[PDB]
Subunit: 283 residues, 5 copies
């Protein structure tokens, strides 16, 4: 059964204006997130700098992706009558999300594990498996949604969506097992924060398949609009909310190292207005 | 009753030149503001770094928005005879302000509360309510002014403007109550500065509805010009003036922490040519 | 009496090539100036950081303006025969200077006063008056040269030029009075440098009205070329020369504070190969 | 015997979408790599800063190259029927890789030798030979693949490929001999890491000739797609994997200098979650 | 006698591909150089920061120039048959080098004198003369090669080339005399490095007139190609090689100041793998 792809639908003026807003809102929010990451990078010790590196990468690639999509949007539809009619570049308002996710979901996995308590073979095993799984979930998604059948084949979307779902399950299990093993080896305060942060990333992941199901089941300007609103909103919530959460844990673990004498930090660490550690200098 | 949207009016050469100037002036002013924020970020302690983060975000998003609009302006009107006639891109000289405001008004709320005395559940309750309220005021504004009716429906502008006004009131009350609760718990010097800063943000907010009322009541090149001049000028005044004001309070509270022994700061803090605290090092 | 605006003249290949060179030379020089400002920002104490902020802003806004103009130049003339014929974008090779000046002349005023000895009501009174005066001089200039009459009305150029000249006089007097009051309260070395720097900014200002007089009196490709050469050259000389000069005074006043025990500085300060203060640390 | 160049093939929608994805994925990955390099630059002592400089250069040049290629891709094919047909810009989706490699392979050579134990005339001799050899391998490759015969001559591809292969062998031998001489003069831990890193760069180099052989042997959209996938994937693996590996060795050698008293480092160095050296200050 | 300018020649596919490569190679190399300058700026004391400022400027202006030229190249030729035929933008693939040189040759002069031992009136006299001479050599070159006669007049090229040659001689003599006077007042190690560096800049300068002589004597695609290859290659060699050389001298003079007690430096200075000074702190 053939369906029409999301980038094939003509848009009303309302829909065209809504999509522009959500794309530009997301790009802007992500650029704020990038700046936040840069400005707060010194709050975290060198032992937990991977958290900052991972988050910087998420914010940079996501920003670039949305900037590309906003420009593609301006060039991918032509006003004809009262409708905006998609040209051959309209696909570049949807496909670049798959590029973003191909990097960002693996980097999220790395960010989450950066503040967990794993080392040795297990650490490397877990990080590789989780990165690989995360990449494959997005890539198989991209094949169904964009490449095989040109986004128009229900069978292709279903098959590749199911494959993507398997990699989702695998990655999730690998990450959840890692966190579960770490929580006993963390301080109560960190353990609690890490558990909460883990629910937010997994739960945030469940929103994205919903846009894929729309592509399978419904076509039209309203549905294209819905896809962009759902994915823009998920991108904002996941890439500001979650990133803030790991930063807090990295700060807390830094401060615990300072108080334990494991390391020193050049500035005081404040979390929710409360001082967690004092500024210090090497002897 | 149908009206014509602001981006539908033909412009005289004078009007076209004035709008270009104001858009480019605002973009430039905001880019200066961004640089100022970056250069002065080390004047504030880690306890008050949210002020800098919030302000950086305002300046980055606003700058991008105006750069986009200046480019849209160059492509959204065609010189025909002695008039500049808007094409289908002219709406991108108005609509991106709603993107900017959708981030900046929530970030202003965060900036103001960053230097207040809250913490606890109330802090999170207040920050979320104020962010949500602020976002909804702009978004409902965007629906009336751009989306529902295509900016041409008086009824839609009135209804959505009224809804936006309710969210304005709510956000204002939430913020004013927070400040009022904080002022007794601040030092007199900070309390006085914080009260003044609060009047400037609320008062600055009242200018923006005036451009919305123009869209409702008057159409033509002169009115489009007026809208852009009012909104550009408000953007400049609010995003340079207010941001400077919170930075001063964050500096003053930093210096008070240094003198109280609550924290140390790597450089001396100067405010209006007077030294507030000395440079210090961890023991 | 009608005249032709500068952006209306056809250019010979020689003139077109000269203008490109001067615009690109100025943009490049200003981008160097920006980099210089960033690289030398730590040579100045926090008490005089406004000098660096002001100068950063001048360099960023001026650079952006010239980059815009160089791109506008490439799109605002079409090679037809042996002539370059201006299209409707040619005005964007002249008008953006008014945007630049609208920010830069106020920021110059702020830079000059940043190293003077004023505080209290007078300080704020002077800074506001000088900023306001400076902005109005440029804005009234822009109205005569670009907006009212489309740059083609001699009467409009004369009237608005005279108004701009009044604001020039006012701003100059306000600044000169401030400097004159400061010089007795500075050390001889700084006083001497500040007096010299003040003559360079005022004298540099007198070049700009000459380009305005050309617009009034002469039209043609040679005159358009002359306007661009004069304004490009003035921009280079004023925005590299003067900025260097205030930086030196800020360095000298920093070093005098270090030697007086008023503050400490993390590095040694060198001025013209001679060490002015040693690197120090907080007790 | 004439063949068709890779940029001459028409692409199906699937192929066009795959190439876009891989180009954008590589550009994004490399931009992450650049950010990583900048954020982790302070983990390495000044004695080994060449490693960071070399790696920064690889990441900046590669990113720029891919950004250029992604934009070229959007302009170098036109949708005609169900095919994307290459225009005269399509060659700019292949040729810029040769620019990237012309800098990056010499910089990789420099990065590898940056952490080796070699100095004096031999050091300069080795660095020059390896840089020269590396540059010539790419340049002779570019001549066969792009310039002589316009990418369409089998004889030219074979001859210039063979020449490029000779320079490959020479560069490899020079580098391997340098590493082999260094390994005895390093600590066991560093020696082991350096040996591993050396295999990864040489092995990574062997992938690239495979894309050249495709150009010789097979033409069509599938083959163009294959070339881009292989080269994008190799670029990602070599420019994220190898660069991480030298950074670790530079960190380890830094930490060994700190523990030996040869130098001090401002922060603690952590490698795989284990502390290698403490933060220190000059006496 | 009329000749054809370099930007008037049609290019074969081979020539077009070679020029693209060299322009993109140079832009990329210079962007690496910029990054190198930024990453190594803290290796030099404040007494010698002019070296870093000068070099930063060379690298920023040169990079921008080549980026402009690469984009101009993509738009300045049209594929027609088997030839690339220049349009009216092709001149922007040659003329921007004159902009770059107009800043970079004066900045090279400043860089060389930054590490010499001249000071007082002589210092300012020398720096002004050398900057002025350097600027005039390039500007008179630009007049002959681009402006007067449109690059087509042999007489104009000869006359203005001769004038440019006089300014070359003057600038060279001024610089050589300064170095010669400095060498006795430097330590042997620095004196030797400074003498070598001086030969490299003067010798590097002699390559550029050769491209000018081609323009006079030969016209065609091969000659245009030759001009771009010679000038690109000279730009790479002069703006990476020489800049590295002054940085080393600035590092060595910094280290000598540290060992003499003239100043302190925050990190150790390493030159060719050997430690020259230890990291220190203010007493
Ligand atoms: C296709 C897209 C796939 C994307 C995958 C990206 C993989 C790389 C992720 C980052 O890679 C990771 O970076 C951090 C950077 O701190 C390094 O971590 C290292 O440095 C930090 C300090 O900075 C130390 O605290 C840490 O103990 C040490 O192992 C890791 O050794 C490296 O593996
Ligand atoms: C729709 C668009 C709405 C956009 C809103 C986006 C902003 C919301 C999040 C604000 O981001 C806010 O950043 C500051 C960064 O200093 C964090 O604050 C944290 O770090 C600072 C700085 O060390 C500490 O002083 C502070 O005590 C600690 O709580 C907040 O915990 C986080 O909530
Ligand atoms: C239309 C366009 C007009 C543009 C005009 C812009 C005017 C404001 C720009 C300068 O604004 C000025 O910034 C400096 C930044 O150091 C602040 O100055 C403050 O911080 C510095 C340190 O950084 C202290 O030494 C100083 O004592 C303190 O007052 C001023 O309080 C603020 O008023
Ligand atoms: C065609 C394209 C080819 C590109 C090749 C470019 C080669 C030059 C780039 C590397 O150039 C190299 O930079 C490092 C930068 O640290 C310098 O290295 C110098 O500084 C570092 C500190 O930064 C010291 O630890 C080192 O001992 C010292 O020699 C080298 O002296 C220089 O030769
Ligand atoms: C056509 C346009 C060509 C323009 C060429 C450039 C013009 C000359 C620019 C020279 O800019 C030069 O910058 C350095 C920056 O360190 C300043 O130098 C000053 O600061 C440094 C520290 O930073 C001190 O070591 C030095 O003793 C002091 O004089 C010079 O005083 C200034 O003259
Ligand atoms: C910041 C971006 C994030 C976290 C993106 C997440 C995306 C997914 C979790 C996607 C999952 C999918 C499936 C499980 C089924 C097929 C469709 C996908 C790719 C959307
Ligand atoms: C820096 C940007 C700021 C502070 C923008 C503020 C915008 C508003 C306060 C807008 C308010 C509106 C209403 C209250 C009703 C009419 C619609 C709006 C959105 C203009
Ligand atoms: C860096 C830019 C500077 C210092 C620009 C200065 C511009 C002026 C001083 C302009 C003055 C003018 C008049 C006094 C008369 C009318 C025309 C003006 C605007 C050029
Ligand atoms: C990061 C980029 C890298 C490491 C690129 C490497 C490229 C090569 C090793 C290319 C080698 C080639 C040959 C040995 C034969 C001819 C074709 C070449 C240029 C691909
Ligand atoms: C980094 C750029 C450099 C060092 C450029 C140097 C250019 C010259 C030395 C040019 C000299 C010329 C003459 C002496 C004769 C006329 C032609 C010129 C301008 C190329």
């Amino acid at each position: 059964d053939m369906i029409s792809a999301p980038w094939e639908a003509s848009l009303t003026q309302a829909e065209h204006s809504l999509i522009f807003y959500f794309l530009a809102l997301t790009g802007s929010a992500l650029l704020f997130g990038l700046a936040r990451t840069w400005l707060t990078r010194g709050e975290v010790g060198a032992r937990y700098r991977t958290a900052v590196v991972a988050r910087s990468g998420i914010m940079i690639v996501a920003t670039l992706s949305y900037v590309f999509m906003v420009l593609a949007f301006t060039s991918g539809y032509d006003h004809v009558g009262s409708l905006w009619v998609p040209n051959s570049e309209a696909i570049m308002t949807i496909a670049p999300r798959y590029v973003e996710w191909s990097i960002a979901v693996p980097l999220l996995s790395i960010e989450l594990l950066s503040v967990a308590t794993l080392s040795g073979v297990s650490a490397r095993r877990t990080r590789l498996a989780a990165v690989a799984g995360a990449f494959l979930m997005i890539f198989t998604g991209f094949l169904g949604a964009v490449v095989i059948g040109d986004g128009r084949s229900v069978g292709s979307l279903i098959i590749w969506g199911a494959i993507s779902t398997v990699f989702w399950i695998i990655t999730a299990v690998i990450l959840i097992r890692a966190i579960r093993h770490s929580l006993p080896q963390l301080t109560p305060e960190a353990a609690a924060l890490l558990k909460t942060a883990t629910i937010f990333l997994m739960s945030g992941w469940a929103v994205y398949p919903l846009a894929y199901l729309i592509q399978i089941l419904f076509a039209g300007g309203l549905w294209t609009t819905s896809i962009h609103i759902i994915l823009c909103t998920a991108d904002i919530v996941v890439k500001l909310g979650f990133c803030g959460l790991i930063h807090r844990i990295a700060k807390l673990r830094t401060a615990e190292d300072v108080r334990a004498g494991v390391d020193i930090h050049t500035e005081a660490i404040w979390i929710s207005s409360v001082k967690q550690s004092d500024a210090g200098i090497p002897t």
